[PDB]
Swiss-Prot record:
Classification via InterPro entries: Isoprenoid_synthase_dom_sf, Terpene_cyclase-like_1_C, Terpene_cyclase_plant_C1, Terpene_synth_N, Terpene_synth_N_sf, Terpene_synthase-like, Terpene_synthase_metal-bd, Terpenoid_cyclase/PrenylTrfase
Domain statement: The Asp-Asp-Xaa-Xaa-Asp/Glu (DDXXD/E) motif is important for the catalytic activity, presumably through binding to Mg(2+).
Annotated positions binding substrate: D276, D280, R418, D421, K437
Biological function: Catalyzes the conversion of geranyl diphosphate to (+)-(4R)-limonene. Produces exclusively the (+)-enantiomer. Can use neryl diphosphate as substrate. Has no activity with farnesyl diphosphate.
Protein name, as recorded: (R)-limonene synthase 1, chloroplastic
Length: 514
């Protein structure tokens, strides 16, 4: 709670300035023509990989699109599959990542039907491990690939850079991380390379520092809004979680053009944090039922008449925030989304009530019934609604209605989110055992120990990602690929924050030197 309002207002990054933005345009051009001189397919694939991990890919989307579509055109040619496990895995990953069909059969040559995968090259095993997270349901080569590579990478840790790479891939594969989060680590990896492109590296450092400066300015503005509502003064438990909330919102949507999206997400998350504390710590069941009903009615007069005192400000802050959100979209693009957004908020609040009734009844649901409700209460459906409504111009009515139909991709993405959050519960918190989350439900239902339940839940997430990979590749859903990314980035942020939940200070506030 050190990064308070006064601290945020005091920042004055040098990289907001117009001179830096000029040198960035200069470097972007010199990089675009250097990309023209990359003609060998593996070099092109390694180029895309580098652009993505450096945080630079959204500046070169046409150039990446061209490389990838040309490689797709060519990769059924006769002697294309050189049978380099590293190169085959890199290509499989990048093509699947960007929605191009590639069969799991590209790996069958590295695999004996009796003894499994045969490889001793760490580079190829690492790349195959990353590629296995792009698997679909029922791809037994890819499942077997993951078994083989994770076993090999674990034994790798029982050369100093090799151990670090194995550790990093085991705790967070590339498919499970949003692009900017890794940028500072990879930027240093990249400059320590003999063959580094020097302009690219300099562009990566500059764009990282400019992004920080952009976010600091947004934080000054969001900070003032939080101060004005004064919830942190009324409710002694309403701690300032603004920077933490902004971190989630930046993981959901990092690009400069999504400033409004990050603002609405940050304030939504700060309010969710307070409301959630009310529902599973401070409110009595009778109070929780009035607040639920006041949300459902969406009637300020009723709410001020009937709510407890310590709930009136929290409700009116939500109410006015959402009504101004609706106003902003109406003004911007003449779309009326109030019923949608307040419906999404109601679903969250209702899911919270269900959990509070479970807790007072000392009822312990089976994992499946817990997750049905828990995927809503983790805020997945609300957050993708918020992201879509604040991050899309023009809003497509058909696209919004698909989100409101509770589609499969939202269902399974939010289940992962919920499982991943519940894994953040600690061991001493399982023993007092008051309110039951994923681990306790699974232990009660299977008799597994806590340690085994954690491992089974971690495997469940990896299997559920396989379903998400299928919905992401479905070119026939109403969700654009842009909208789906908000959702995946939410899940990825939960994976990242389980590891690190000071990296937020490092992401937002300390530039990369020179
Ligand atoms: C921040 C965000 C994007 C969504 C809210 C869910 C989340 C990840 C939390 F950390 C909220 O607290 P908590 O872990 O207490 O949520 P609970 O487990 O009580 O439902
Ligand atoms: Mn809760
Ligand atoms: Mn909680
Ligand atoms: Mn939790």
């Amino acid at each position: 709670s050190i990064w308070d309002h006064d601290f945020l207002q005091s920042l004055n990054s040098n990289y907001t300035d117009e001179t830096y933005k000029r040198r960035a345009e200069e470097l972007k051009g010199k990089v675009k023509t250097a990309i023209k001189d990359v003609t060998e397919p593996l070099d092109q694939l390694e180029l895309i990989d580098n652009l993505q991990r450096l945080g630079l890919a959204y500046h070169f989307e046409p150039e990446i699109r061209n490389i990838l579509r040309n490689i797709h055109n060519h990769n059924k040619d006769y002697n294309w599959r050189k049978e380099n496990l590293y190169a085959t895995s890199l290509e499989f990953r990048l093509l699947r990542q960007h929605g191009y069909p590639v069969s799991q059969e590209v790996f069958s040559g590295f695999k004996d039907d009796k003894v499994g995968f045969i490889c001793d090259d760490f580079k190829g095993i690492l790349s195959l491990h990353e590629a296995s997270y792009y698997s679909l349901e029922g791809e037994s080569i890819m499942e077997e690939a993951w078994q083989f590579t994770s076993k090999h990478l674990k034994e790798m840790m029982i050369d100093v850079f090799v151990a670090e790479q194995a550790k990093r891939a085991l705790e967070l594969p590339l498919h499970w991380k949003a692009p900017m989060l890794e940028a500072r680590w990879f930027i240093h990896v990249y400059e320590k390379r003999e063959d580094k492109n020097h302009l690219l590296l300099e562009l990566a450092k500059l764009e990282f520092n400019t992004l920080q400066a952009i976010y600091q300015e947004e934080l000054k503005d969001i900070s003032g809004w939080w101060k004005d509502t004064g919830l942190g003064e009324k409710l002694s438990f309403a701690r300032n979680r603004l920077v933490a909330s902004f971190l989630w919102s930046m993981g959901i949507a990092f690009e400069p053009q999504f400033a409004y999206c990050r603002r609405v997400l940050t304030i939504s998350i700060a309010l969710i944090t307070v409301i959630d504390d009310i529902y599973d710590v401070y409110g009595t069941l009778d109070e929780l039922e009035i607040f639920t009903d006041a949300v459902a009615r969406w009637d300020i007069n009723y709410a001020l008449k009937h709510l407890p005192g310590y709930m009136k400000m929290c409700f009116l802050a939500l109410y006015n925030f959402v009504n101004e959100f609706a106003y902003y979209v109406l003004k911007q693009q003449d779309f009326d989304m109030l019923l949608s957004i307040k419906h999404a908020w109601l679903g969250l609040i209702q899911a919270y009530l269900v959990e509070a009734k479970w807790y007072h009844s000392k009822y312990t649901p089976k994992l499946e019934e817990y997750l049905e409700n828990g995927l809503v209460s983790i805020t997945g459906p609300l957050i993708i609604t918020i992201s879509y409504l604040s991050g899309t111009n023009p809003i497509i009515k058909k696209e919004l209605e698909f989100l409101e139909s509770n589609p499969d991709i939202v269902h399974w993405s939010s289940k992962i989110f919920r499982l991943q959050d519940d894994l953040g519960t600690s061991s001493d918190e399982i023993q007092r055992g008051d309110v039951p989350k994923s681990i306790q439900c699974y232990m009660h239902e299977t008799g597994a120990s806590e340690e085994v339940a954690r491992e089974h839940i971690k495997d469940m997430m990896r299997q559920m990602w396989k379903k998400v990979n299928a919905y992401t590749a479905d070119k026939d859903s109403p969700l654009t690929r842009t909208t789906a990314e908000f959702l995946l980035n939410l899940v990825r942020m939960s994976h990242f924050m389980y590891l690190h939940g000071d990296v937020g200070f490092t992401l937002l506030f300390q530039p990369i030197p020179l």
